[PDB]
Coordinates of C-alpha atoms and ligand atoms in Angstrom, one line a residue:
Chain A
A1 CA 7.1 32.2 9.4
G2 CA 4.9 31.9 6.5
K3 CA 5.2 28.1 6.6
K4 CA 2.8 26.1 4.5
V5 CA 1.2 23.0 5.2
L6 CA -0.7 19.8 3.9
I7 CA -2.6 17.6 5.8
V8 CA -3.4 14.4 3.3
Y9 CA -5.9 12.4 5.5
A10 CA -7.5 9.8 5.4
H11 CA -9.9 8.5 8.0
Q12 CA -14.0 8.3 7.4
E13 CA -14.7 9.5 10.5
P14 CA -14.5 12.9 11.9
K15 CA -14.8 11.9 15.4
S16 CA -12.2 9.3 15.4
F17 CA -9.0 9.5 17.2
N18 CA -7.4 9.8 13.4
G19 CA -10.0 12.9 13.5
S20 CA -8.4 14.1 16.8
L21 CA -5.2 14.3 15.6
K22 CA -5.9 15.7 12.0
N23 CA -7.9 18.9 14.3
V24 CA -5.4 19.1 16.2
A25 CA -2.6 20.1 14.1
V26 CA -4.9 22.0 12.2
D27 CA -5.7 23.6 15.5
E28 CA -1.8 24.0 16.3
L29 CA -0.4 25.0 12.8
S30 CA -3.1 27.7 12.2
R31 CA -2.3 29.3 15.7
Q32 CA 1.4 29.2 15.0
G33 CA 0.3 31.6 12.0
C34 CA 1.0 28.8 9.7
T35 CA -0.9 28.4 6.2
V36 CA -2.7 25.1 6.4
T37 CA -4.8 23.0 3.4
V38 CA -6.1 19.5 4.2
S39 CA -7.2 17.1 1.5
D40 CA -9.4 15.3 3.5
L41 CA -9.7 12.2 1.2
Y42 CA -12.6 10.3 1.6
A43 CA -14.7 13.3 2.1
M44 CA -13.7 14.3 -1.6
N45 CA -14.1 10.6 -2.8
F46 CA -11.0 10.7 -4.1
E47 CA -10.4 8.5 -6.9
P48 CA -7.3 5.6 -5.8
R49 CA -7.4 3.7 -9.3
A50 CA -4.8 4.5 -11.8
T51 CA -6.6 4.6 -15.2
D52 CA -6.2 6.5 -18.4
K53 CA -9.1 8.4 -17.2
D54 CA -6.3 10.4 -15.4
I55 CA -5.6 11.8 -19.0
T56 CA -7.5 14.5 -20.7
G57 CA -7.5 14.2 -24.6
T58 CA -5.4 12.2 -26.9
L59 CA -3.4 9.3 -25.4
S60 CA 0.5 8.8 -26.3
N61 CA -0.4 5.6 -27.1
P62 CA -4.0 5.0 -27.7
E63 CA -2.9 1.4 -28.5
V64 CA -1.2 0.1 -25.3
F65 CA -2.2 1.9 -22.3
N66 CA 1.3 2.3 -19.7
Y67 CA 0.4 4.5 -16.8
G68 CA 3.7 5.7 -16.4
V69 CA 4.4 7.1 -19.2
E70 CA 1.3 8.1 -19.7
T71 CA 1.4 10.7 -16.7
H72 CA 4.5 11.5 -17.3
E73 CA 4.1 13.0 -20.6
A74 CA 0.3 14.1 -19.7
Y75 CA 1.9 16.1 -16.6
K76 CA 4.5 17.7 -18.9
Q77 CA 1.7 18.8 -21.6
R78 CA -0.4 19.7 -18.8
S79 CA -3.3 17.1 -19.7
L80 CA -3.5 15.5 -16.2
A81 CA -6.9 14.9 -14.7
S82 CA -7.9 18.0 -12.5
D83 CA -8.6 16.0 -9.3
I84 CA -4.1 15.0 -9.3
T85 CA -3.5 18.4 -10.6
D86 CA -5.7 20.2 -7.5
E87 CA -3.3 18.1 -4.8
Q88 CA -0.3 18.5 -6.8
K89 CA -0.8 22.0 -6.4
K90 CA -1.6 21.7 -2.9
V91 CA 2.2 19.7 -2.8
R92 CA 4.0 22.4 -4.8
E93 CA 2.6 24.8 -2.6
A94 CA 3.7 23.0 0.8
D95 CA 6.7 23.4 2.6
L96 CA 5.3 20.0 5.1
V97 CA 3.3 17.7 3.9
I98 CA 1.8 15.6 7.0
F99 CA 0.0 12.1 6.2
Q100 CA -2.5 11.1 8.7
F101 CA -4.2 7.4 8.7
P102 CA -5.0 4.5 10.3
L103 CA -2.6 1.5 9.2
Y104 CA -4.4 -0.7 6.8
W105 CA -2.3 -4.0 6.0
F106 CA 1.1 -2.6 7.7
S107 CA 1.2 0.3 5.0
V108 CA -1.9 3.3 3.9
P109 CA -5.1 2.9 3.4
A110 CA -6.3 2.2 -0.2
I111 CA -7.7 5.7 -0.8
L112 CA -4.3 7.3 0.2
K113 CA -2.1 4.7 -1.3
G114 CA -4.4 5.8 -4.4
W115 CA -3.3 9.5 -3.7
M116 CA -0.1 8.7 -3.2
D117 CA -0.4 6.8 -6.9
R118 CA -2.1 9.2 -8.9
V119 CA -0.5 12.5 -7.5
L120 CA 2.8 11.6 -7.2
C121 CA 4.0 11.2 -11.0
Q122 CA 7.2 11.3 -12.9
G123 CA 8.1 15.0 -13.8
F124 CA 6.3 16.2 -10.6
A125 CA 7.7 14.1 -7.9
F126 CA 10.7 12.5 -9.6
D127 CA 12.6 12.3 -12.2
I128 CA 14.9 10.7 -14.6
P129 CA 17.1 12.3 -12.9
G130 CA 16.0 13.6 -9.9
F131 CA 15.0 11.1 -7.0
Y132 CA 16.4 10.3 -3.6
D133 CA 18.2 13.2 -2.6
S134 CA 18.0 15.3 -5.7
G135 CA 14.1 14.0 -6.0
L136 CA 12.1 16.4 -6.8
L137 CA 10.4 17.7 -4.3
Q138 CA 13.5 18.2 -2.8
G139 CA 13.5 21.2 0.0
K140 CA 9.9 20.0 1.2
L141 CA 9.7 18.2 4.4
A142 CA 6.9 15.0 5.0
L143 CA 5.9 12.8 8.2
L144 CA 3.9 10.1 8.8
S145 CA 1.3 10.1 11.7
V146 CA 0.2 7.1 12.1
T147 CA -2.1 5.0 14.6
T148 CA -1.7 1.0 15.1
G149 CA -4.3 -1.4 16.5
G150 CA -1.2 -3.4 17.7
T151 CA 0.6 -2.2 20.4
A152 CA 4.1 -0.7 20.8
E153 CA 6.0 -3.5 21.6
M154 CA 4.1 -6.2 19.4
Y155 CA 6.4 -3.6 16.8
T156 CA 9.4 -4.2 18.2
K157 CA 12.0 -6.1 16.9
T158 CA 11.5 -9.2 17.8
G159 CA 7.9 -8.9 18.3
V160 CA 5.2 -10.9 16.3
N161 CA 4.7 -7.6 13.7
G162 CA 8.8 -6.5 13.8
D163 CA 9.7 -3.4 14.2
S164 CA 7.7 -0.2 13.2
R165 CA 10.3 1.0 11.1
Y166 CA 10.0 -2.5 9.1
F167 CA 6.8 -1.2 7.8
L168 CA 8.1 2.5 7.6
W169 CA 10.8 1.6 4.4
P170 CA 7.9 1.5 1.8
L171 CA 6.3 4.8 2.5
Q172 CA 9.4 7.2 4.2
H173 CA 11.8 5.7 2.2
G174 CA 10.8 4.1 -1.4
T175 CA 7.7 6.9 -1.7
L176 CA 8.9 10.1 0.4
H177 CA 12.4 10.0 -0.3
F178 CA 12.8 8.6 -3.3
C179 CA 10.7 12.4 -4.5
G180 CA 13.1 14.1 -3.0
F181 CA 11.6 14.9 0.6
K182 CA 13.2 15.2 4.0
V183 CA 11.3 12.8 6.4
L184 CA 11.0 14.1 9.8
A185 CA 10.6 11.0 12.2
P186 CA 7.3 9.9 12.2
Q187 CA 4.4 10.6 15.0
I188 CA 3.3 6.6 15.8
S189 CA 0.4 6.5 18.2
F190 CA 0.0 3.1 18.7
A191 CA -2.9 1.3 19.7
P192 CA -5.5 4.0 20.9
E193 CA -8.6 1.8 20.5
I194 CA -7.7 0.1 23.7
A195 CA -5.7 2.8 25.6
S196 CA -7.5 4.3 28.4
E197 CA -9.0 8.0 28.0
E198 CA -5.9 9.1 29.6
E199 CA -3.1 7.8 27.4
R200 CA -5.5 9.1 24.5
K201 CA -5.1 12.5 25.4
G202 CA -2.0 11.9 26.0
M203 CA -0.8 10.9 22.8
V204 CA -3.1 13.7 21.3
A205 CA -1.0 16.1 23.5
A206 CA 2.3 14.8 22.4
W207 CA 1.2 15.3 19.1
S208 CA 0.1 18.6 19.9
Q209 CA 3.5 19.2 21.6
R210 CA 5.5 18.3 19.4
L211 CA 3.5 20.0 16.8
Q212 CA 5.1 23.3 18.6
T213 CA 8.5 22.8 17.5
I214 CA 8.1 20.9 14.3
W215 CA 10.0 23.6 12.3
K216 CA 13.1 23.2 14.3
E217 CA 13.1 19.2 13.7
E218 CA 15.8 17.9 12.1
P219 CA 15.4 14.6 9.7
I220 CA 16.1 11.4 10.2
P221 CA 18.5 9.8 7.8
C222 CA 16.0 7.8 5.7
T223 CA 18.6 5.2 5.2
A224 CA 18.4 1.0 5.4
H225 CA 20.1 0.9 8.0
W226 CA 18.0 3.5 10.5
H227 CA 14.8 1.3 9.1
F228 CA 16.7 -2.1 9.3
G229 CA 19.9 -1.9 11.5
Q230 CA 20.6 -2.1 15.3
Chain B
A1 CA -4.4 -33.5 -7.5
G2 CA -7.9 -31.3 -8.1
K3 CA -5.8 -27.8 -7.0
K4 CA -7.8 -24.4 -7.6
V5 CA -5.7 -21.5 -7.7
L6 CA -7.3 -17.6 -7.9
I7 CA -5.1 -15.3 -9.3
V8 CA -6.2 -11.4 -8.1
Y9 CA -4.8 -9.6 -11.1
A10 CA -4.3 -5.4 -10.9
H11 CA -2.7 -4.3 -14.6
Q12 CA -5.3 -2.0 -16.5
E13 CA -3.3 -3.1 -20.2
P14 CA -4.3 -6.5 -21.3
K15 CA -1.2 -6.5 -23.5
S16 CA 1.3 -5.8 -20.9
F17 CA 4.1 -7.7 -19.3
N18 CA 1.9 -8.0 -16.2
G19 CA -0.8 -9.1 -18.3
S20 CA 1.4 -11.4 -20.1
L21 CA 2.4 -13.0 -16.9
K22 CA -1.1 -13.4 -15.6
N23 CA -1.5 -15.3 -19.1
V24 CA 1.1 -17.4 -18.7
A25 CA 0.0 -19.0 -15.4
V26 CA -3.5 -19.0 -16.7
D27 CA -2.5 -21.7 -19.4
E28 CA 0.3 -23.7 -17.6
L29 CA -2.1 -24.3 -14.8
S30 CA -5.1 -24.8 -17.0
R31 CA -2.8 -27.4 -18.6
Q32 CA -1.9 -28.8 -15.8
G33 CA -5.7 -29.7 -14.9
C34 CA -6.1 -27.0 -12.4
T35 CA -9.4 -25.0 -11.4
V36 CA -8.6 -21.4 -12.3
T37 CA -9.9 -18.2 -11.5
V38 CA -8.8 -14.7 -12.4
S39 CA -10.2 -11.4 -10.6
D40 CA -9.1 -9.1 -12.9
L41 CA -9.3 -5.7 -11.0
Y42 CA -9.4 -2.9 -13.6
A43 CA -11.7 -4.8 -15.7
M44 CA -14.0 -5.2 -12.9
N45 CA -14.0 -1.6 -11.6
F46 CA -13.1 -3.4 -8.2
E47 CA -13.7 -0.5 -5.6
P48 CA -10.5 0.0 -3.5
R49 CA -12.5 2.1 -0.7
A50 CA -13.2 1.5 2.6
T51 CA -16.6 3.2 3.5
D52 CA -20.1 2.5 5.3
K53 CA -21.0 1.8 1.5
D54 CA -19.0 -1.7 2.2
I55 CA -22.0 -2.2 4.8
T56 CA -25.4 -2.6 4.1
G57 CA -27.4 -3.7 7.6
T58 CA -27.7 -1.8 10.8
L59 CA -24.6 -0.1 11.9
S60 CA -23.3 -1.6 15.4
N61 CA -22.6 2.0 16.3
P62 CA -24.3 4.5 13.7
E63 CA -23.0 7.6 15.4
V64 CA -19.2 6.7 15.4
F65 CA -17.9 4.9 12.0
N66 CA -15.3 2.4 13.2
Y67 CA -14.5 0.3 9.6
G68 CA -13.0 -2.5 11.8
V69 CA -15.4 -3.3 13.9
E70 CA -18.6 -2.5 11.5
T71 CA -17.3 -5.1 8.7
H72 CA -16.7 -7.3 11.5
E73 CA -19.8 -7.5 12.5
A74 CA -21.1 -7.4 9.2
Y75 CA -19.6 -10.4 7.9
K76 CA -21.2 -12.2 11.0
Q77 CA -24.5 -11.2 10.3
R78 CA -24.3 -11.6 6.5
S79 CA -24.8 -7.7 5.9
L80 CA -21.3 -7.4 4.0
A81 CA -21.1 -5.5 0.1
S82 CA -21.8 -8.5 -2.3
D83 CA -18.6 -7.4 -4.2
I84 CA -16.6 -8.6 -0.7
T85 CA -18.4 -11.6 -0.6
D86 CA -17.9 -12.3 -4.1
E87 CA -13.7 -11.9 -3.6
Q88 CA -14.3 -14.2 -0.3
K89 CA -15.7 -17.2 -2.1
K90 CA -13.1 -16.9 -4.0
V91 CA -10.1 -17.2 -1.8
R92 CA -12.1 -19.6 0.8
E93 CA -12.1 -22.5 -2.6
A94 CA -8.4 -21.6 -3.6
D95 CA -5.7 -23.8 -2.5
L96 CA -3.2 -20.9 -4.2
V97 CA -4.1 -17.3 -3.9
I98 CA -1.4 -15.7 -6.5
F99 CA -0.8 -11.7 -6.5
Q100 CA -0.3 -10.7 -10.3
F101 CA 1.2 -7.3 -10.8
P102 CA 3.5 -4.5 -11.3
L103 CA 5.3 -2.8 -8.1
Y104 CA 3.7 1.1 -7.6
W105 CA 5.9 2.5 -4.8
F106 CA 7.2 -0.2 -3.3
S107 CA 4.0 -2.1 -2.8
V108 CA 0.7 -2.5 -4.3
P109 CA -1.4 -0.9 -7.0
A110 CA -4.1 1.2 -4.8
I111 CA -7.0 -0.7 -6.7
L112 CA -5.1 -4.2 -5.1
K113 CA -4.4 -2.5 -2.2
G114 CA -8.1 -2.1 -1.8
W115 CA -8.7 -5.8 -2.4
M116 CA -6.5 -6.4 0.9
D117 CA -8.4 -3.5 2.8
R118 CA -11.9 -5.2 1.9
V119 CA -11.5 -8.6 1.5
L120 CA -9.4 -9.5 4.3
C121 CA -11.9 -8.7 7.1
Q122 CA -11.8 -10.0 11.0
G123 CA -13.9 -13.1 11.0
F124 CA -13.2 -13.7 7.4
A125 CA -9.2 -13.9 7.2
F126 CA -8.5 -13.8 10.8
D127 CA -9.7 -13.8 14.2
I128 CA -8.8 -12.1 17.9
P129 CA -7.1 -15.1 18.7
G130 CA -6.5 -16.4 15.2
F131 CA -3.9 -14.7 13.0
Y132 CA -0.4 -15.4 12.0
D133 CA 0.2 -19.3 12.2
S134 CA -3.4 -19.2 13.2
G135 CA -4.7 -17.1 10.8
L136 CA -8.5 -18.0 9.2
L137 CA -7.0 -18.8 6.1
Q138 CA -3.8 -21.8 7.2
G139 CA -3.8 -24.3 4.6
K140 CA -3.6 -22.1 2.1
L141 CA -1.0 -21.0 -0.3
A142 CA -0.3 -18.0 -2.0
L143 CA 2.4 -16.7 -3.9
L144 CA 3.3 -12.6 -5.0
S145 CA 4.1 -12.2 -8.9
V146 CA 6.2 -8.5 -8.8
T147 CA 7.2 -6.9 -12.0
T148 CA 9.8 -3.7 -11.1
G149 CA 10.9 -0.8 -12.8
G150 CA 13.8 -1.0 -11.2
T151 CA 16.8 -3.8 -11.7
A152 CA 17.8 -6.3 -10.2
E153 CA 20.9 -5.2 -8.9
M154 CA 19.3 -1.7 -7.5
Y155 CA 17.3 -3.9 -4.9
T156 CA 20.2 -5.6 -3.4
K157 CA 21.2 -4.3 0.2
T158 CA 23.7 -1.9 -1.3
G159 CA 21.8 -0.7 -4.1
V160 CA 19.5 2.5 -3.6
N161 CA 16.2 0.5 -3.0
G162 CA 17.6 -1.8 -0.6
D163 CA 16.9 -5.5 -0.9
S164 CA 14.2 -6.7 -2.9
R165 CA 12.7 -8.6 0.1
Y166 CA 12.2 -5.1 2.3
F167 CA 9.9 -4.1 0.3
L168 CA 7.6 -7.7 0.7
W169 CA 7.1 -7.4 4.6
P170 CA 3.8 -5.6 4.5
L171 CA 2.6 -7.7 2.0
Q172 CA 3.5 -11.1 2.7
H173 CA 4.2 -10.7 6.4
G174 CA 1.9 -8.3 7.4
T175 CA -1.0 -8.9 5.8
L176 CA -0.5 -13.0 3.9
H177 CA 1.2 -14.4 6.7
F178 CA -0.9 -12.4 9.3
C179 CA -4.1 -14.6 7.8
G180 CA -2.5 -17.8 8.3
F181 CA -1.2 -18.5 4.3
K182 CA 2.0 -20.2 3.6
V183 CA 3.8 -18.0 1.8
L184 CA 6.1 -19.4 -0.9
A185 CA 9.2 -17.3 -3.0
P186 CA 8.0 -14.4 -4.4
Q187 CA 8.6 -14.2 -8.4
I188 CA 10.1 -11.0 -9.2
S189 CA 10.3 -9.9 -13.0
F190 CA 12.6 -7.4 -13.0
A191 CA 12.9 -4.1 -15.5
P192 CA 11.1 -5.7 -18.3
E193 CA 11.0 -1.5 -20.1
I194 CA 14.6 -1.8 -19.7
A195 CA 15.2 -5.8 -20.7
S196 CA 15.4 -6.7 -24.2
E197 CA 12.5 -8.8 -26.2
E198 CA 14.5 -11.9 -25.9
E199 CA 15.0 -11.0 -21.9
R200 CA 11.5 -10.4 -21.2
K201 CA 10.5 -13.8 -22.9
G202 CA 13.1 -15.5 -20.6
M203 CA 11.2 -14.0 -17.8
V204 CA 7.6 -15.1 -19.1
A205 CA 9.1 -18.8 -19.9
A206 CA 10.6 -18.8 -16.6
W207 CA 7.6 -18.0 -14.5
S208 CA 5.6 -20.4 -17.1
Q209 CA 8.6 -22.9 -16.3
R210 CA 8.4 -23.0 -12.6
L211 CA 4.3 -23.3 -12.3
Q212 CA 5.3 -26.7 -13.7
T213 CA 6.3 -27.6 -10.2
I214 CA 4.9 -24.9 -8.2
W215 CA 3.1 -28.1 -6.6
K216 CA 6.0 -29.5 -4.9
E217 CA 7.7 -25.9 -3.9
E218 CA 8.2 -25.4 0.1
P219 CA 6.9 -22.1 1.8
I220 CA 9.4 -19.6 2.5
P221 CA 9.9 -19.3 6.5
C222 CA 8.2 -15.6 6.7
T223 CA 9.9 -14.0 9.6
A224 CA 11.9 -11.1 10.1
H225 CA 15.3 -13.1 9.3
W226 CA 14.5 -14.3 5.6
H227 CA 13.2 -10.5 5.0
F228 CA 16.0 -8.5 6.6
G229 CA 19.1 -10.7 7.5
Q230 CA 21.2 -10.6 10.5
Ligands
FAD1 C1 -8.5 -2.8 7.3 C2 -7.3 -2.7 8.1 C3 -6.9 -2.9 8.3 C4 -5.4 -2.8 9.4 N1 -4.5 -3.4 9.2 C5 -3.9 -3.0 10.8 C6 -2.0 -3.4 10.7 O1 -1.9 -3.9 9.7 N2 -1.5 -3.1 11.6 C7 -2.4 -2.4 12.7 O2 -1.6 -2.4 13.9 N3 -3.6 -1.9 13.2 C8 -4.1 -2.7 11.7 N4 -5.8 -2.2 12.0 C9 -6.0 -0.7 12.9 C10 -5.9 0.3 12.4 O3 -4.9 0.6 12.3 C11 -6.8 1.0 14.2 O4 -8.1 0.2 14.3 C12 -6.6 2.4 14.0 O5 -5.3 2.9 13.9 C13 -7.4 2.8 14.7 O6 -7.1 4.7 14.4 P1 -8.8 5.0 14.4 O7 -8.1 6.8 14.3 O8 -9.5 4.3 13.6 O9 -9.6 4.8 15.9 P2 -11.0 5.2 16.7 O10 -11.7 4.3 17.4 O11 -11.6 6.3 16.0 O12 -10.5 5.8 17.8 C14 -10.5 5.4 19.5 C15 -10.3 6.2 20.4 O13 -10.2 7.0 21.0 C16 -11.0 8.0 20.9 N5 -10.6 9.0 20.9 C17 -10.9 10.2 19.7 N6 -10.4 11.3 19.6 C18 -10.0 11.3 21.3 C19 -9.0 12.5 21.5 N7 -9.2 13.7 21.5 N8 -9.3 12.3 23.2 C20 -9.0 10.8 23.6 N9 -9.4 10.2 22.7 C21 -10.1 10.0 21.9 C22 -12.4 7.3 20.2 O14 -13.4 7.9 20.8 C23 -11.8 5.8 20.3 O15 -13.0 5.6 21.4 C24 -6.7 -2.5 10.7 C25 -8.0 -2.2 10.7 C26 -8.7 -2.1 9.3 C27 -10.1 -2.0 9.5
FAD2 C1 2.3 4.5 -9.9 C2 3.7 4.1 -10.4 C3 4.7 3.5 -9.2 C4 5.8 2.6 -9.4 N1 6.2 2.6 -8.4 C5 7.8 1.6 -8.7 C6 8.4 1.8 -7.3 O1 8.2 2.0 -6.0 N2 9.7 0.4 -7.4 C7 10.0 0.3 -8.8 O2 10.5 -0.8 -9.1 N3 8.8 0.8 -10.1 C8 7.9 1.3 -9.9 N4 7.0 2.0 -11.0 C9 7.3 1.0 -11.9 C10 6.6 -0.3 -12.6 O3 6.5 -1.1 -11.7 C11 6.9 -0.4 -14.2 O4 6.8 -0.1 -14.9 C12 6.2 -2.2 -14.1 O5 6.4 -3.2 -13.5 C13 6.2 -2.6 -15.6 O6 5.1 -3.7 -15.6 P1 4.5 -3.9 -16.5 O7 3.7 -4.8 -17.4 O8 3.7 -2.1 -17.2 O9 5.5 -3.8 -18.5 P2 5.4 -3.6 -19.6 O10 5.3 -2.0 -20.2 O11 3.6 -3.9 -20.3 O12 5.8 -4.4 -21.0 C14 7.5 -4.5 -21.2 C15 7.5 -4.2 -22.7 O13 7.0 -6.1 -22.2 C16 6.4 -6.1 -23.2 N5 5.8 -7.9 -24.0 C17 4.4 -8.1 -23.0 N6 4.1 -9.1 -23.1 C18 5.6 -9.5 -23.2 C19 6.1 -11.0 -23.8 N7 4.5 -11.9 -23.5 N8 7.2 -11.3 -24.0 C20 8.0 -10.5 -24.8 N9 7.2 -9.2 -24.5 C21 6.6 -8.8 -23.6 C22 5.4 -5.0 -23.7 O14 4.8 -4.9 -25.0 C23 6.2 -4.4 -23.1 O15 7.1 -3.8 -24.8 C24 5.6 2.5 -10.9 C25 5.3 2.8 -12.0 C26 3.8 3.1 -11.4 C27 2.9 3.9 -12.5
1PQ3 C1 -1.8 -6.6 12.2 O1 -2.2 -6.3 12.9 C2 -3.4 -5.9 12.8 C3 -4.3 -5.5 13.3 C4 -6.1 -5.4 13.0 N1 -6.9 -4.8 14.0 C5 -7.3 -5.1 15.3 C6 -5.6 -4.7 16.4 C7 -8.2 -3.9 16.5 C8 -8.0 -2.7 16.2 C9 -7.1 -2.2 18.3 N2 -8.1 -2.9 18.4 C10 -5.9 -5.7 12.0 N3 -7.4 -5.6 11.7 C11 -8.2 -5.2 10.1 C12 -7.1 -5.9 9.2 C13 -6.1 -6.1 9.6 C14 -5.5 -5.6 10.9 C15 -4.2 -6.0 11.5
1PQ4 C1 6.7 6.3 -9.8 O1 7.3 5.5 -9.9 C2 8.4 4.8 -9.4 C3 9.4 4.2 -10.9 C4 10.3 4.2 -9.9 N1 11.7 3.0 -10.9 C5 11.8 4.0 -12.2 C6 12.5 2.7 -12.7 C7 10.4 3.3 -12.9 C8 11.1 2.5 -14.6 C9 9.6 2.1 -15.1 N2 9.2 3.2 -16.4 C10 11.3 3.8 -8.7 N3 11.6 2.8 -8.5 C11 11.8 3.2 -6.5 C12 11.5 3.6 -5.6 C13 10.2 4.0 -6.3 C14 9.7 4.5 -8.0 C15 8.9 4.5 -8.3
ZN5 ZN1 15.5 6.7 3.0
ZN6 ZN1 5.7 -14.0 8.2

C-alpha cells in the first residue's frame, strides 16, 4: 500500500449527499490504510478568481497583465500565493485526486473551477512540452465523482441533456488528461434529491464498494471516441 | 429598432485581446444606436462562490442548506443578494447577451462560471417546467465570443483538442439553451498570442464586421448533432 489520496470537495453543506460521498471516501480509504487529505473548498473560502494577487512580489510585466505568463513565471520563481502552493503540494503528494461535486451548469461549481484555474498552472500541471499523455501529473490518477439533478435517462445521447459523457469532455479530457492524469471512470450519482432513501443508500454503497477496489482499476481511454462515439 | 445588449466580460487586463474585442463590440453596437451595458466582472470583483450569503431572508431549511432550493425561494421572496439581482435586471432588459472571455480549461473563467451559477437561478432563468425551448429567457439571444491559446487546427475533430464545438456544449446547450436563449454562432478568435499583429488586427476587425449585421443572423440549432455530428 502507501497510497495517497486528495479529495477536492465542493459542497456548502456537511449533511448533503455530496458530503456523505466525501465522508464515505475518507472512511473507506482511511480503513484501507491510505493517506487521505481533503480540500473542503467552501469551508476554506477558497478564492476562485484568477487575479494579480496570485503572484507575490514583482510581476514579470507590471504594465500589462497576462495571467498565464505571470503564473508560469511565478511557479518557476516560487512566487505564487500560498493558497495556490498549499494545493499544489497536496496534488504533488497525491497518487489519486478525487473531485467530489454537484453538477452546476454541466460543469463544476465555480469555486472548484477556480481551484482548477489557479492551482493547475503551467510548469506545475503541464508545460511545453508535457501535456495530454506527457502531462506533468503523469503517473497520477484522477476521478470525477459527480451528483446531478437530472436523471440517468435525461443524460442519454437522445435525451434532453445528451450523454453524460458529453459534459465530461472539458473536465476529463480538456483538464485532467491535459495535465497527464490517467482518468478513472467517473462516478455519477444521478438525481439523489428525488431518489428514494433506499436508492440513495444504494448509490453511496456503490461508491464505498467501488472504493474497496479503486487501486485495481483500469483508467478509461480518454479520447473523443470514448466521449462522443457509439 | 431599439435593441439592448449586455456584454458579460471576463478579463483582468484592459489592454488584452479580450479587452479589444469587448471595446470594439461596445463601439460598433453603440454606433448602430443600440443600448449597451457591460458587466466587467473582474473590475466589479464579482463574487463567484455559491454560498448562503446569497440569501438574506429566512431560510426554507436553516438546518440543511440546499443552494438551489434556497435561491429559488429567495428569488420569489426577493431576498437574494443585491449583486445577483443587479445582474438579473441587466439580463431581463437585454435582447442579446454577449459573453466575452478567454477559454480556461475548455470552459469559462471561474469568475464568469460564478456569474452563471449565481445569476441564472430557478424562477429567474428557468422553472420546472420551463426550460430548454420553454426556458424563461426565451426571446433573447446569446453569443459566446471566446479566445483560445490553441490554434484552429488543434481544435478540429482529428486535432489533439477535438473540435471546437465539443467544448461549447455545456455552455451553449447545458446553460444558455436550458434557460431558453436562442444561441447565435460562436465567435472564436483562435490563438491571438501566436498570431501576428496583422492577424490579430484582422480578428478584431472580423468581429466588428460581423457585429454590423448581427441582428440579421439566425441562431444555431443548439442540438447534439450541431455540436458532435452524426
Ligand atoms: C447553480 C446550480 C446549477 C445546477 N446545474 C445542474 C446541471 O447542469 N445539471 C443537473 O443535472 N443538475 C444541476 N443542478 C442540480 C444539482 O446538480 C443537484 O442539486 C445536486 O447534484 C444534488 O446533490 P446534493 O449533494 O446537493 O444533494 P442533497 O440535496 O444534499 O441530497 C439529496 C438527499 O440525499 C440525502 N442524503 C445525504 N446523505 C445521505 C446518505 N448517506 N444516505 C441517504 N441519503 C442521504 C439528503 O439528506 C437529501 O435528502 C444545479 C444546481 C445548482 C444549484
Ligand atoms: C487558467 C488558464 C486556462 C486556460 N485554458 C485554456 C484551454 O483550455 N484551451 C486553450 O486553448 N487555451 C487556454 N488558455 C489560454 C487562453 O485561452 C489564452 O491565453 C487567451 O485566450 C488569450 O487571450 P488574451 O486576451 O488573454 O490574449 P492577449 O495576451 O491579451 O493578446 C495577445 C496579444 O494581442 C495583443 N492585442 C490586444 N489588442 C489588440 C488589438 N486590438 N490588435 C492587435 N493586437 C492586440 C496584445 O497586446 C497581446 O500582445 C488558458 C489560460 C489560462 C490562464
Ligand atoms: C440542466 O439541468 C439542471 C437541473 C437543475 N436542478 C434540478 C434538477 C433540481 C435538482 C433535482 N431536484 C438546475 N438547477 C439550477 C441551475 C441549473 C440547473 C440545471
Ligand atoms: C492551463 O492552460 C491551458 C492552455 C492550453 N493551450 C495553450 C496553447 C495555451 C497557450 C496560450 N498561452 C490548453 N489547451 C488545451 C487544453 C487545456 C489547456 C490549458
Ligand atoms: Zn482525454
Ligand atoms: Zn441546445
